[PDB]
Amino acid sequence: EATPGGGRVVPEDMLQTDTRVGLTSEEVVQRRRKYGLNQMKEEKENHFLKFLGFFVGPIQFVMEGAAVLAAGLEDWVDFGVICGLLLLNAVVGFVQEFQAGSIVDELKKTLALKAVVLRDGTLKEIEAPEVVPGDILQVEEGTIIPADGRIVTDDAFLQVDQSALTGESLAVDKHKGDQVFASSAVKRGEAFVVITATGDNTFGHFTEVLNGIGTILLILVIFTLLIVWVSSFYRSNPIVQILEFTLAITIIGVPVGLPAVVTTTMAVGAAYLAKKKAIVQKLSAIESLAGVEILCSDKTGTLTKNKLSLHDPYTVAGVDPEDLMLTACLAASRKKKGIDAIDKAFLKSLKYYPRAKSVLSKYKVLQFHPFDPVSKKVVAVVESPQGERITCVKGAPLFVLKTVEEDHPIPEEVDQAYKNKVAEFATRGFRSLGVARKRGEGSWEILGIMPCMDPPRHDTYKTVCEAKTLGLSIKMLTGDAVGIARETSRQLGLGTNIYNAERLGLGGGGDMPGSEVYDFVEAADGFAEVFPQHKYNVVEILQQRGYLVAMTGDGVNDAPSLKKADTGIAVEGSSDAARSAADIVFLAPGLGAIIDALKTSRQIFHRMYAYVVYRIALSIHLEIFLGLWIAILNRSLNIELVVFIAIFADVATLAIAYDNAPYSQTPVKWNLPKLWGMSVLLGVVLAVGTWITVTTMYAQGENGGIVQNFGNMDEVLFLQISLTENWLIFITRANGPFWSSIPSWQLSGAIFLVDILATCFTIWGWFEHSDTSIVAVVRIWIFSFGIFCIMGGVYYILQDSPKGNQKQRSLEDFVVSLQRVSTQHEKSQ
Ligand SMILES: Nc1ncnc2c1ncn2[C@@H]1O[C@H](COP(=O)(O)OP(=O)(O)O)[C@@H](O)[C@H]1O
Ligand SMILES: [K+]
Ligand SMILES: [Mg+2]
């Protein structure tokens, strides 16, 4: 739909009836199709078909058949308890989904790509979707194009970053009148857009683990049901008793709300993270951040502050006595609303008497090449009152000399002093900037170096120290030379193994064997003189060795690296494209925020893992107890008691998402074989405890075994199962022994209340025909505590360079060699 779907001259050319700057009277627009068309607003706030949706399903059908086959509404004892359990599961699921969907949207709101349109006044900006179609737009150097459309008549070329919706990853340089694609970035440019198709033709991992776990649990429940049905067939049980058995085992076996409570834990953790100034794009980024082993962070803005200190410019040069300040400030963009960190320090340190007032007047800029990362060099051409074209150049100290090597070519008197001074200021931890000037058509003097300095953030050193205890390995990425990077590493205690990116082999190699360039990249404390492509190459290499890499991105240059990284982190002050391509967007600066978010994500993952182990352990426990007891002895717990056991497993679990869970000291990952081993062993231990409990009463009579004065088997088993099952959470939510960390008051209270309810059940026996002695419950508590201790001890006991053989090194060498020979041949002699 182009012409008949909301597009013609009056939303196209009537846009361009005013000047560039101005817009008035969004009049009667007749249609606001802007808010992610029919995606979030699709069937708005139904809020009642989610409730009934939880009442329909495989297990819910089994429960409905159970509640119907209880002689209908004859008596409110079996029907009442079964419908109560079904209602409780439905309500808990609905509340959890509501909480998880009402808090992931609050993170979406605080991260929407706000869009700027300039009207008569200095209009701030327009919130993303509520912008009228057929309206002007200002896409400015790394902003996600809010609305699809075409360019405005003004002449300028913007390099739109594509391959998000198209194929080519290179410069897709639409110039004038072409189709500008929405939800795409702009690498560089300054153009205006006319809106067309404002919402038309816009062309995790824990969930899969949960799905697999649920499938295996279903398999286990089916196996148990098969045992029960076979053993009932051999005994010719009436169909009603078989149905009661299968209902009990269906209730205990399949966890109704495992993925729901896992998503609730993720959502609560994401909300807590966003409270800590760390907004998560996709809910799956929590696990990815918890799993990262290497954090490749840019030095500027993360490991150090963006404000620079200037210390005595090196004005020791030839004829040029003081021109450093004047010519360097000549190359200032002076916008004061889009200038970078480098530009500010020149203006703040312009306390120069002779000509600093007269140097900013009449020096009209003709050409201003922006700072190119591949060149590390800003070049400006301006006018002067003398009439000359002073082409200022400013960049890395060596690159300025590489620029001035043509005229006045490398005199030994000045070049040696220049290199010695830049090395000296590297030793002093000073960022240096060189400047060269062009008076005439054949003059090229070298002015000198400018010793800027940006100190590390006051919390950076201890943050890096603690990051080594967390299992991370921080790899700094500097565009600076090797000397400055190495001195910064010495200052930060980051270790001094800094390799120049181009020399090492990131990209076009230097005939370094491929098996060892990967080894150097893996064991490297940093990378100096890094270009945008080297970031992606570093991420690609580090993942081959088997790591999970977290990249600190900022700006549109490192968007592909952010996408390729397992956890792309958009640091403070990033552009719209950088945070759109990242996984976690930060609203606080420094590495301290990143490390705090890492610790929080590890805590959230610990909560998730502890709950999963809890759920499947008690599932295995209670299924291999009840199924075995039915098979061997044609007996099972009273249906009301087993329903209440299931309920108690949905009360002590709506609190796991809110507790003081500790964080692992090493990167944490889904070790599914170890998870299943631990859970099967815990369930087997619990089942052995329960079987001991019941075989005591077989051995010494109904009221003579684990019970002392009087009791009944069913309520005693109820109490033992409830205690040993709910107390299992205290050992899964710990690092080592269960007494290491103190559980939160909420979890402890919710579990102690359930324990009190189970004890009252046993003492007064209000679902069976007899009560239990007050000393029998004491003995059951003692035995359950012993089982808890042995189970926790089992859980605690089992809780705990070239990275390649000949095959791996050969493979990496072959990969790098084939890349190099492809380049070599492609050169075609
Ligand atoms: N705006 C600028 N004008 C001139 N030189 C610059 C500018 N920004 C950075 N440089 C120089 O380029 C080199 C590193 O630039 P960069 O790659 O930007 O460091 P970072 O990537 O850590 O911001 C250093 O020599 C620095 O002084
Ligand atoms: K990613
Ligand atoms: Mg940087």
Author numbering: 66 to 268, 284 to 880, 892 to 920
Q: From the publication, what sentences describe this entry?
A:
The plasma membrane of fungal and plant cells contains a proton-pumping P-type adenosine triphosphatase (ATPase) that maintains the intracellular pH and generates a proton-motive force, driving the import of nutrients by secondary transporters. Unlike any other known P-type ATPase, Pma1 is a hexamer that localizes to specific ordered microdomains in the fungal plasma membrane. Autoinhibited Pma1 hexamers in the plasma membrane of starving fungi are activated by glucose signaling and subsequent phosphorylation of the autoinhibitory domain. We have determined the structure of hexameric Pma1 from Neurospora crassa by electron cryo-microscopy at 3.3-Å resolution, elucidating the molecular basis for hexamer formation and autoinhibition and providing a basis for structure-based drug development.
An atomic model was built into the monomer map and then extended into a hexameric model by symmetry-assisted placement of five additional copies into the hexamer map. Our molecular model comprises >90% of all residues, lacking only the N-terminal extension (residues 1 to 65), and two loops (A-M3, residues 269 to 283, and M10-R, residues 881 to 891), for which no continuous density was visible in the map, probably because of flexibility. The domains of Pma1 are arranged in an E1 conformation, with the N domain in proximity to the P domain, as required for MgATP-mediated phosphorylation of Asp378. We added 600 μM AlFx to the sample before grid preparation, with the aim to stabilize the enzyme in its transition state of phosphorylation, E1~P. However, we did not find a clear density for AlFx in its expected position between the adenosine diphosphate (ADP) β-phosphate and the Asp378 carboxyl group. We have hence captured the basal state before ATP hydrolysis, occupied by excess MgADP. As expected for a prephosphorylation E1 state, access from the cytosol to the proton-binding site is open in our structure. The M1 helix with its characteristic 90° kink (induced by Pro123) is embedded deeply inside the membrane, forming a wide funnel-shaped access toward the H+ binding site in M6, similar to the Ca2+ entry funnel in SERCA (and see more detailed discussion below). The mouth of this access pathway is negatively charged because of the conserved Glu162 in M2, and it extends into a large aqueous cavity between M1, M2, M6, and an unwound region in M4 around the conserved Pro335. Asp730 is situated adjacent to the internal cavity and opposite the equally highly conserved Asn154 in M2, at a distance suitable for capturing a proton within a hydrogen bond (2.9 Å between the aspartate carboxyl and the asparagine amide). The additional C-terminal autoinhibitory R domain forms an α helix that folds against the P domain.
